[PDB]
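Hello again,

I reread your note about wanting to compare the complex against the isolated chains. To keep things tidy I'm splitting this into two emails, and this first one only covers the full assembly. Below are the input lines as submitted, including protein chains and any nucleic acid or small-molecule components. They are followed by the predicted structure of everything together. The single-chain runs will come separately.
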Amino acid sequence: MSNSAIPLNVVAVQEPRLELNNERTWVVVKGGQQVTYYPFPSTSFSSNQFNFICNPPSAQTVLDRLVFIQVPYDITFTANPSHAGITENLLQPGRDAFRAFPISSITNTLNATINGFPVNIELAQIIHALSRYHTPLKVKNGWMSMQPSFEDNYQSYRDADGANNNPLGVFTSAAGLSELPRGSYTMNVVTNTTTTARITGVLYEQVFLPPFLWDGEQAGGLANLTSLTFNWVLNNNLARIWSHSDITNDVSGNSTIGSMNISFQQPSMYLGFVTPRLNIPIPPRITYPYFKLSRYTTQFQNTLAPNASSTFKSNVVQLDSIPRKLYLFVKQSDNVIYQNLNNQITTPDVFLQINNLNLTWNNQQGILSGASSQNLYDFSVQNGYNKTWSEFNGVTQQFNGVSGQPTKVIGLEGGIVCLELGKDVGLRDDEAEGVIGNFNLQVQMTVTNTNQYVTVTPDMYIVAVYDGTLVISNTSAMASIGVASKEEVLNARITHGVSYNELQRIYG
Amino acid sequence: MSNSAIPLNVVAVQEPRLELNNERTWVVVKGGQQVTYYPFPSTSFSSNQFNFICNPPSAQTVLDRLVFIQVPYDITFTANPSHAGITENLLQPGRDAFRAFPISSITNTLNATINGFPVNIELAQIIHALSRYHTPLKVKNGWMSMQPSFEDNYQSYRDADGANNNPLGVFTSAAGLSELPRGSYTMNVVTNTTTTARITGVLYEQVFLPPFLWDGEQAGGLANLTSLTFNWVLNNNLARIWSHSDITNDVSGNSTIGSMNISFQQPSMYLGFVTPRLNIPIPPRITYPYFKLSRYTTQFQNTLAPNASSTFKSNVVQLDSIPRKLYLFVKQSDNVIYQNLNNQITTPDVFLQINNLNLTWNNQQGILSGASSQNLYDFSVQNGYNKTWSEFNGVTQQFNGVSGQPTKVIGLEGGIVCLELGKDVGLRDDEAEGVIGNFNLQVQMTVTNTNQYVTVTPDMYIVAVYDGTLVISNTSAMASIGVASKEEVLNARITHGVSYNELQRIYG
Amino acid sequence: STIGSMNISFQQPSMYLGFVTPRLNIPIPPRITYPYFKLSRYTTQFQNTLA
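Full-complex prediction:
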């Protein structure tokens, strides 16, 4: 031990098979007396918007943070006149299924309110980039399984067909023990014949929010509130729920599917309530972590395709408080791909591949500027990117045998760089993830178009997330951001007691 | 006009037409008696070495800063098989001339020793990025007119063809009071026929390098020397003098001209020793400003074309002091042009368009990253760039009017950035334009090939000019750099009695 | 004429401002004054033509 320049202190550790002996204790695990579940059929609901209001039985009854709502529906497709031909049915065995996640990508904006105070997530645009981010294979296969789950990898559906992994495929043709393709989900068909299709079944989808959690790691439950209400509203077109492929749709013509129509019944949220046992009392007022996520977006009308890069810059934006992290990406632009049935159904959700980033921050310019794009990936994976370096970084070639074919290139989605703010930006002294007040940052970066078939007009987002504390008391809901005072942060004590990677589990 | 905001003083001034009253002296301009022009014929010259040894007649003689060599020459070219080809004469009315500037573009290194202290500069590479950069129109028709001087504005000679700005045109074809094409520079031809061409003339060229000058205005000469000299060593290939247009050759000739053998006859330099009037004395030991060119070129093999975009970097290179100015540009790499007679003659010396430049000053990164490539121009023309924005970033579109025909694009010879180092980088303090030492920089810029016809391996250059003072006395030649303490600079008084524009005049 | 008609359309557009922050030691005065010129124009029309 004291063989080095500085004697370092020794300890011995018993190898696992011979771990015995050490004092062992019998451990008794105590849950609350009564644990219950009830459906709340939405008190008011219609075509374009529906909502619930579901008061807890009493204060003094903790509630399960893991929530979800189940929605029964009806879709019927009509056969479009007059794309030429039309032989083979209207639905295909490998060519179409629900977009994932089906009822989340519809939702314009979720909105809950805890205890008289409002908390809200804009849900539609946000979910597709957030969802990439924290799932491993255990989690993607747990709760996250309920809605159709398989994110879209192929930059353009048509050429995907028919790979083992094709985003939309049936249950057969998925590998044993791994994320199953979107076509596996059960929807009974009342009738599928060329000219017409009608299909009908229930579909589940969680409330993605904070406090409420979607990932498994359990955490303490919301007590002690009095009122709870949820609100939802649907982003207009709503044909978008469905997905499709180009292969079936025909030369210099139109797709066969357009147009369809949808219909719902009354959907019902599902809340749990555990009422704690008489031995241990729950504290008068209590405090919960609470993160709120925004989005700031930019449109630039010009176009590039199939593969030539240019620069785009995002209008300078202000923040009220250093957010705990922020994602950056570019993607196909929302203003287009909303008009036209074909355009709505069959265009996948994916990202142009980032060639290099160069953000600035209050004011500076440029942080992260001189790092290979490669380098953005491997510092994002550190926060849990979970997709192979090749899935990120766009396209992959492919050669064929036979003279003389051309060698087909495939686009397959570009990554989304994410940087924690202490972890990767570096803040000037005595600013830390909570601290208020005023900052502004404008990312600017370059991106190359990946796919071969269409011209992509683009847009870019920036999703910032703010982390603070919220005090559900009886009865109020003071919510605080800027919990750490600036002077305060300077001279805070450093504990080696709590390891860092431990604080990577808290999420939100 | 003590009515505005905070009040201020008013002075009245006189219109030019009438002053008319003011104490008007008469200034007798005296310059020393017995001005003389010497003509030293080089002794010891070969095809590879010019070697003048030229002493001043006394101490007390003050020789003038503008020096220049003249050199008679003899070239012969002989047609190649198998072309072919060929009908026509070997030299063409538009196709050829000398490369500006003939004498320098061949010199490996010019070298001179003021008073036993060796001062040299490398002429071959540095000079073509030096030409573009400090001459307006007025100066281009002044002294610099003696060697061919018109700059290479087309990306490849073949495209310029017959055009009004075409570099290699006759005397006709260049408007009045305008820079002449290099074909107009006189030479007399013993024979020009198919198979053979034999030409002869006289070439001037001004000795470049400090403390001599090729600027028009001039300052005070270098009394009081006892020694002087000059030595040019030349590249052995020496075919680089001529320039030829690709149009004639066709495919697989590939070209008519090669080979060719150049020859020199003893050259002779011209110095001008004035001597001051007895009455007015010159000081015993006297001081002058003195700059010093330094270059590092970095080559990376990879080849982009005809018009791909890429990125590069240079190995870090430490410096011993802040340099007054700094020049960055991507050239068509040298190594590829040297092999072969065909190639050496028929490739103009031009630069690739800079899409964006980002560089790092010492241990500091991201500088200039955010600024638009058009912005690079804005602050560099302010330095004195003298060339239409259109030619910087060069590429131009001329469309033809006849059905079944595509329009054609023309490569235009990109630019070369330069950033005075206290002006355009900004400096942490106290640091100046001279202070030692040890800062380390590296550059990483993204370029685009614009040349329409050839794949181009590129290369990067960085020229700096360190600043200091050279003090000559008989008999010594002390030279310094640093010159001011890092503390003494921190508190020297800013004087309003000069115009920053005064320091633009002392090139440099 | 040959044309006809035409339509124009702009994409995102962007200003480019220079800045620089005066070196900490030297102090720029609190209140400063610059020259400024207001350019204004008027015109008068005429009914009869010449040619």
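For quick reference: The two ends of chain A are 43 Å apart (CA to CA).

B.
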